[PDB]
Design a protein around this ligand. Structure first.
Ligand SMILES: O=C(O)[C@H](O)[C@@H](O)[C@H](O)[C@H](O)COP(=O)(O)O
Ligand SMILES: O=C(O)[C@H](O)[C@@H](O)[C@H](O)[C@H](O)COP(=O)(O)O
Ligand code: NI
Ligand code: NI
Lengths: 187, 187
């Protein structure tokens, strides 16, 4: 039997989606993700901020179908490192994604299985094409929430493990007032 | 060789994507689509207006990859029928699509292979899930351009013929200043 087409309202100012399933990630949920573990433990013990929220409208994992989700990535730093999403590869590696930036100042860090990295800056209106095989993480390099919408194949799934252990070959930090993308010393 | 990730700017006020492949549909390119063949004929002679333009960023037709396109669907009527896109099923029938309304007032007309129909209103921020098996046409029911962004599987393709011959089982008209969705008499 056919599934019912539907329309949902997405508020471009808040990233909120009608009828979506919410996921909240606090700093506590990201142990082993940031370089400055001391700054991380400090911030978690102190206030444990929400780093991001995701509003997902997902389908059964089936070829050819599509999921979509907004993420509201909060502004902040862990030491010199800007707040970011955990990042993942797809489970079905060759699945692509399209992102549409809606609000705030940010960027995406991408890397291949071999760890070659790319950085793509994002401001409202930027659409980013995440090709097959690239892991991706977004980073909020500004003072307000960075909000985007992602559309991904329903069967892409998420591989978080490889990134959780090694991280990305690069990191995004504030150095002398400027945003810089530099080698990750942990890598 | 992995493909290069990239970002492109989409202008939410004009629907233009910087450097995208541009397509123009004038009314003469849509013979056999509107119920009122005489009004079609006359509007073509008098003016042949652009019905819509599409800005597409497409990938090769591989499974799991994704394309995205904006459409600027211009305001107008053919007889009593509102301007609309030709409409299509996908070549690979079970491919879904996600549309994001950016500007204007419009809506989407959808139908199954058996001709069962559904109408979904679209205002800015409305996200529509076009499920597998559903043919889809967008309609401009306002007096300004209706602009939206669609993201669709790169392998979905476009099957126009079914629709080109017999149309949708419903039409969207203006009657006494009011937008109405009614049975298509020529279906
Ligand atoms: O595959 C996806 O669903 C998209 O990448 C996106 O919706 C992403 O999941 C969120 O922005 C959360 O980021 P993380 O999944 O890396 O935690
Ligand atoms: O599958 C697609 O590519 C989307 O449905 C969308 O991008 C659509 O093609 C245009 O809005 C024009 O509509 P038509 O393809 O019916 O002419
Ligand atoms: Ni993803
Ligand atoms: Ni389509």
């Amino acid at each position: 039997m056919y599934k019912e087409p539907f329309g949902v309202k997405v508020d471009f100012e808040t990233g909120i989606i009608e009828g979506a399933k919410k996921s909240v990630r606090r700093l506590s949920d990201m142990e082993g993700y940031f370089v400055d573990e001391r700054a991380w433990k400090e911030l978690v013990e102190k206030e444990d901020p929400v780093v991001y929220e995701v509003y997902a409208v997902e389908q059964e994992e089936k070829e050819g179908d599509l999921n979509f989700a907004t993420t509201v990535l909060y502004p902040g730093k862990v030491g010199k490192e800007f707040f970011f999403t955990k990042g993942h590869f797809h489970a079905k590696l060759d699945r692509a994604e399209v992102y549409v930036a809606l609000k705030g100042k940010g960027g995406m860090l991408l890397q291949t299985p071999e760890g070659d990295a790319k950085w793509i800056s994002m401001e409202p209106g930027t659409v980013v094409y995440v090709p097959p095989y690239w892991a991706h993480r977004t980073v909020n390099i500004g003072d307000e929430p960075f909000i985007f919408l992602a559309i991904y194949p329903a069967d892409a799934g998420h591989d978080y493990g490889t990134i959780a252990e090694k991280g990305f070959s690069k990191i995004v930090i504030e150095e002398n007032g400027e945003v810089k993308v530099v080698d990750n010393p942990r890598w």
